Amino acid sequence: FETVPVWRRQPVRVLSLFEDIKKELTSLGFLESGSDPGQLKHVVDVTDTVRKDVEEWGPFDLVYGATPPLGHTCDRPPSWYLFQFHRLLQYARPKPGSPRPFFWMFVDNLVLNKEDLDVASRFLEMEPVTIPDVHGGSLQNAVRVWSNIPAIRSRHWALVSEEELSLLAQNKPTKLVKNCFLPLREYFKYFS
Template identity: 45%
Template sequence: MAKKEPTVIVVDTDSPEEISSLSEAALPFSYRSSSEVISVSSIGEIPPATPLRPNTAASLENYGLDVISVSSSEGNLPANRENIIYDVIHGVRTIEEICICCGKLEIHTQHPLFHGGICAPCTEQFLERFFLCDQDGYHGDCAICCRAESLIMCDDETCNRCICPSCLDTLIRPGAGKETEEKNIKWTCLLCVPWEKNGVLKRRTRWRAELKRFYDQESNHLWIYQPLGPWEQKPIHVLSLFDNITKELKNYGFLGKGMGNGRLKYLDDVTNVVRTQIEELGPFDFIFGSTPPVAKSYNHPSAWYFYQYYRILEYGRPPARSDKPFFWLFIDNLVLEEEERNTASRFFQMEGLLRYQQHDDVVQNAVHIWSNIPSVQSKYSVSPLYVDLCLLAKNIQKTRIFSQRPATLIKEFFVPLKEYFRTFS
């Protein structure tokens, strides 16, 4: 009897147990002899096939061997993100076939800002993190992958976005990230420069409209207005109830002393304010409201602040079908009772977001926030806190160690408004 040629089984795992089980599953019974099986693992370490880099299976077939490729996971093997430029330039794959955030080939949809694919996990990451900002006034994540600890901030005065060095290396050219970091010069991101392509990174022509469509199609709990270009943005007009947030908005450039800058109207007691007065003062772009700090005395029952805010909010809203960006935000600084917070959630049609301030492992203060600003509703904004809030409020009132205004705890949530309203240096 002629001796059979050995059969090579190519698997993408280093686990002996998986190699054994996958080998058994892949071969007919007549081939299940250990002397006839050669297992090749760690295929994930081998670069993706290109015209200059044939894949492992093709190479083994050149030796006259029967090859059975077996994967321990569903879908295509992940592309090496470092090879995206090579593969796109040499026609191995189009940029639309690769997730430009991580390099995977299991594409869910297309990236909203740049030409290229995006996988399901990166889609979720992008939706939840794109509008998250830091208190320094910039986005907290890379505008491409919505990840990265190291970020390069755009120096355009109308932009507050960042790009990570890894994305520059992967999509523009190797070394571009480090070079940009080390150069002590102003740097402008690809969403702001006149040209639309650098390397294989190409900006979408109508990326703001694409971003709106992306959220509409992919998110079931985050809704956004379409961001506006600098030429479309107007100064913001703010109504601030029960707390004056002029300082916070000035810090981010929304308000200024010059003519034509943003405006803020502060009202402390609105008991006798009627709809016509709000209409005469408006129209408003942003209506803010807050309970007093829990350690300070206040002149009304706790629920008064919520009910009066909601009444004025209804007066100041634009018509239901208006596409004009309009934002609102209400904060409770541990003043509302639990039943009152539940009522607020029912009226606002969303759960309140809990944020707290901590020092040396001691929670000093906490607030609940309701808002239609996208970053407030992100899953990454939630701060799990296993503390009795009633006891915390009593401790603050007893010691009176905390008198900071509630708005100072959530000021980073004002930053996404830069996507819609003009700022001034």
Template identity: 55%
Template sequence: MVNQRNIEDLCICCGSFQIHTQHPLFDGGMCIPCKDNFLESFFLYGEDGYRPLCTVCCSGEILLTCENPSCNRCYCSECVDALVNPGSSAKFQAMSNWKCFLCLPLISENGLLKKRRKWQENLKDFYNRESQRSLEMYKAVPAWKRKPIQVLSLFGDIEEELINFGFLENSSGNGKLKHLVDVTDVVRKDVEEWGPFDLIYGCTPPIGQLSEHPPVWYFLQYYRVLQYAKPKVDSEKPFFWMFVDNLVLTEDDREIASRFLETDPVTMYEMCDEMVKNAVLIWSNIPYMKSNNSALASDWDLSLLAEDIQSLNDFSLWPTRLVNKCFIPLREYFQCFSKDHTS
């Protein structure tokens, strides 16, 4: 603060001087451990729809929550007190309708915690540059420009999940869901007439559910329809896709899916009495899916895991039970209606 050192030469997450890159959101540097933690944790969301970790350091406790209806970010008292001013976290906590540092205007004075001029673009570039693989991301849409989401759901019905997160309501114009069970006769013209779509969802049937088609058929049909629905290459319109396997694809089938979709899957699961109750593999370009915190240990045998789950004799768990939290990041791109119809 007395110009003895450039803030970009300091990791604003932990205070280290071993700088690897710049923080994507705020003025300041970032060391390798903090960079790795940021990549894994930034898109995690809690059950209440808020990010449970600090926006600056992606850790921390005693969190301040932004009260802007279009924001879901939190900040830890350690970062706020260190970068803004000692005691600032208590001051902000006592305020009503507190707006966070990314919601405030660029000229706002908050000590050393200053948001970057184009932080949304910086975040995308940061992930593309620092991730082991390029993560397809879109620029967040300002709340006043967000439009209702248009969804095409293949095989599995996700209406309940979209309603729970406020994407679908009974009133007209509040989002649209088209659900198809059989797409054998669907051609490009059909998809273009139904669309344009913002999210294409598809899944294999649950373990133990009889089907006239082999499991890989569901993926190949999904991939075919996905090509029909994708926007043009130069389009900046946010477009998301997700395919879920309920552990019925073979190892060769999973390799085919990863090659076609150009990304590896993440495994999500439910635990009950220290036992995996249900698990799914998910391929998606939704930001949350990059997080390693949602993945199983890589040395788990998925075929044995599927057998263990099947032995529970509970085939009622549809994959959407596990992927619903993945839809929360979509609130940054599409209109979301709260239950009291005020947002």
């Protein structure tokens, strides 16, 4: 997908699953501050939603998937969130002809086991990239991301490995994932 002239960048239409990022997304100017629902649709439980629902919910420009934040409050198995995310994604993808750019993304807050990770990457057709938020004096934020966003992947983020990410599994957003979402600014309207 090539980049779009600034005067044709229409407002983004997003569908967020299992987690509402309306607050995080409005912060960086993607949704009108007031009374513009048509940009984000949110669903928490998906086991009963059919393609005809997603098709009728209006075409989407971004489909966001996220796991529950680290905490012993998940009735669903960790693999359930991806399988359902992959289930709806093909419901939301437009016709083979591309009228506009279509994006998707799936983030894990370090809840998937390794075999859940290899199943995740096989279904999303890419190995994930890791986004660390390090300041030396802080070890706070770290998530894994599968997405077709061209700029989230290429930038050579700070390379640190998983036994320190499992020091965060001994520990068993504003700065880190807002930096994740910025490259979407170059494709849709900035509301300021």
